[PDB]
């Protein structure tokens, strides 16, 4: 079984970083919707959902490979 870790500040740091990267990426790449004008609740929900998805994937991969 791949090793997973209990919740810590590193896990929070990766998850927060993944959320902030996904918010900026959703700000830049979404075609149909000063820089944060038009930023709505569905776009925030979609970006933060991708942030949780990316953070979960990154946390599991780094816990597998030992970076923790």
| Contacts with ligand CLA, residue ranges (CB under 6 A) | 2, 53-54, 56-58, 60-62, 64-65
- From the list 16, 20, 30, 67, which residue makes contact with other proteins (rule: CB under 8 A)? 30
Q: Considering the rule CB under 8 A, would residue 59 count as an interface residue with other proteins?
A: yes
- From the list 20, 49, 61, 65, which residue makes contact with other proteins (rule: CB under 8 A)? 49
- The residues near 2 (Cβ < 8 Å, ≥ 6 apart) are 60, 63, 64
12 binds, among other proteins, ligand CLA, none (CB under 5 to 8 A by kind): none
Q: How far apart are the first and last CA of the chain?
A: 15
């Amino acid at each position: 079984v791949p090793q997973t870790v209990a919740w810590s500040a590193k896990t929070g740091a990766v998850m927060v970083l993944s959320n902030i990267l996904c918010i900026v990426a959703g700000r830049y790449v979404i075609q149909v919707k000063g820089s944060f004008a038009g930023f709505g609740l569905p776009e925030l929900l979609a970006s933060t959902s991708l942030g949780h998805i990316v953070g979960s994937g990154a946390i599991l991969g780094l816990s597998y490979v030992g970076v923790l």
